Design a protein around this ligand. Structure first.
Ligand SMILES: N#Cc1c(Cl)ncnc1Nc1ccc2c(c1)CC(=O)N2
Ligand SMILES: N#Cc1c(Cl)ncnc1Nc1ccc2c(c1)CC(=O)N2
Ligand SMILES: [Cl-]
Ligand SMILES: [Cl-]
Ligand SMILES: [Cl-]
Ligand SMILES: [Cl-]
Lengths: 124, 4, 124, 4
């Protein structure tokens, strides 16, 4: 086509989706990770995670308002990844890298798994 | 705005 | 913070939101523009448009599944802008620029209004 | 991945 493109559009959309999340506006699911709960938008979760894409395209699970993650999933690891989904920013630290990588593998977030593997290999 |  | 950032994340999220829209997955509103209907995600509309941000933060309108636009709004103009919202690509042409600009003014999409004004000024 |  003969379209023009607004460079910052995708980033501005994501910034606004994060603002809606912070104000709990039109959030439609709560992700339970052991004793912790995280409110989010199903569409954003599906757009970032192979696991959520599978869950919310399921004819029964698409209608659930609560999703319980595997008890082995670390809440801080999940929190860091949920923040990444809404911002493109990953708070990767020596103290959380193992939990972040395990959570990214479970959530099926290949690019996060890739940078975790690379950061781990550099430290060995 | 750019030509993509 | 000490975060790392994935450059393509925002663009990949938007590409997936557009794929969900094309397959009518978790779309939660229909925008009626005279004889035409457009299914979309309320969160994406709010993230792109001052008008939709106002509508869906309203305590009564947030729950509506159908929104009827002003009868002066051109469906093709709306279609071009809805595509822009989900892709960052604006199909701006001599034959549609007036309708696109009027629709962008109504929807409160300042960056689109700005490029339309500039393209019009260049042709006079 | 980059340093933002
Ligand atoms: N929503 C949506 C969606 C669609 Cl529509 N099409 C294709 N992928 C989608 N999302 C999705 C699927 C697999 C993975 C990711 C996202 C990130 C990753 O590492 N794996
Ligand atoms: N959703 C959301 C949203 C939030 Cl949370 N905060 C601030 N603006 C939001 N969206 C929004 C408001 C005004 C305009 C646009 C988008 C594009 C434009 O030209 N004007
Ligand atoms: Cl439920
Ligand atoms: Cl990823
Ligand atoms: Cl309704
Ligand atoms: Cl805009």
């Amino acid at each position: 086509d003969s379209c023009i493109q607004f460079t910052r559009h995708a980033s501005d959309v994501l910034l606004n989706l994060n603002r809606l999340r912070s104000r709990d506006i039109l959030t439609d699911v709560v992700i339970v990770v052991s004793r912790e709960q995280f409110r989010a938008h199903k569409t954003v979760l599906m757009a970032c995670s192979g696991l959520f894409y599978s869950i919310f395209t399921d004819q029964l699970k698409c209608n659930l308002s609560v999703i319980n993650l595997d008890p082995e999933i670390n809440p801080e690891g999940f929190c860091i990844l949920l923040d990444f989904m809404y911002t493109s920013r990953l708070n990767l630290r020596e103290g959380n890298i193992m939990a972040v990588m395990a959570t990214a593998m479970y959530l099926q977030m290949e690019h996060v798994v890739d940078t975790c593997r690379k950061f781990i290999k550099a430290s060995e | 705005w750019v030509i993509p």
